[PDB]
């Protein structure tokens, strides 16, 4: 999965 913090 991408991860819920990947885009910060």
């Amino acid at each position: 999965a991408v991860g819920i913090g990947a885009v910060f």
Partner: antibody, heavy 118, light 113 residues
Framework: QVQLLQSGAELVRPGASVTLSCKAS????????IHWVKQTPVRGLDWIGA????????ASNQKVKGRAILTADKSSSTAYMELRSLTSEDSAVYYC???????????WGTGTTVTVSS | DVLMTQTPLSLPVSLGGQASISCRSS???????????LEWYLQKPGQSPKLLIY???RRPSGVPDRFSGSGSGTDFTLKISRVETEDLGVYYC?????????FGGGTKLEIKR
């Protein structure tokens, strides 16, 4: 040798809250997110939510929404999920699992069997 | 959310045969980086789910090449090539691209002996 430590069981009365804990062992806690998955009997997995130690961001699935509170104690290497106002539909085995960014669920806890009953 | 429709519900297969499990997403599961986070998991009785396949077709070390995955767009397939006694359990597809992440309904492998 990486491990995630979970309680074996919790008996919860209807309307009460449960707090589940996931304690990491053998890796640096802040490098991985902790995700929670619900396994219904015989069949079914549901992603319930996640907490990211590095950024502090949290999320949960909207089917349970308003009732899941996800947190982490970085000094204990421990992740927490509070589930409020339980009913019979919330009885299941709850797993935690870890996830690196753009990775996958490589390590899993052994699961907490949650029963909602009077 | 992204719906994951998995078929068949129950898969009888003889020892040494070939099993194939399909998953159909309600939408494209390509992520903004260009990668697709389709994963396959096996839950053996009494145990936690374990990953077999990640990014549609990639295989972590320790997973035999008898397990293989493929997929375009909405359609994804997992193939077990020579079923072994230990391959029994419930298999799940999973999309990890869009929050909330979702699992398919699961496919129980039954081994004919």
């Amino acid at each position: 040798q990486v491990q995630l430590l979970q309680s074996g069981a919790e008996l919860v009365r209807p309307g009460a809250s449960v707090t589940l804990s996931c304690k990491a062992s053998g890796y640096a806690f802040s490098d991985y997110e902790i995700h929670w998955v619900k396994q219904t009997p015989v069949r079914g997995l549901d992603w319930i939510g996640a907490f990211d130690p590095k950024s502090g961001a949290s999320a949960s699935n909207q089917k349970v929404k308003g009732r899941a509170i996800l947190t982490a104690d970085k000094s204990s290497s421990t992740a927490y999920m509070e589930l409020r106002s339980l009913t019979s539909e919330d009885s299941a085995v709850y797993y935690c699992t870890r996830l690196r960014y753009f990775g996958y669920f490589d390590v899993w806890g052994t699961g907490t069997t949650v029963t909602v009953s009077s | 959310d992204v719906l994951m429709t998995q078929t068949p519900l129950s898969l009888p297969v003889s020892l040494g045969g070939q099993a194939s499990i399909s998953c159909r997403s309600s939408q494209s599961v390509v992520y903004s980086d260009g990668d697709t986070y389709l994963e396959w998991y096996l839950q053996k009785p009494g145990q936690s789910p374990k990953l077999l396949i990640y990014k549609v077709s990639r295989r972590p070390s320790g997973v035999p090449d008898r397990f293989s995955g493929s997929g375009s767009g909405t359609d994804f397939t997992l193939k077990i090539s020579r079923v072994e006694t230990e391959d029994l359990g419930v298999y799940y597809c999973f999309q990890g691209s869009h929050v909330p992440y979702t699992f398919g309904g699961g496919t129980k492998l039954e081994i004919k002996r």
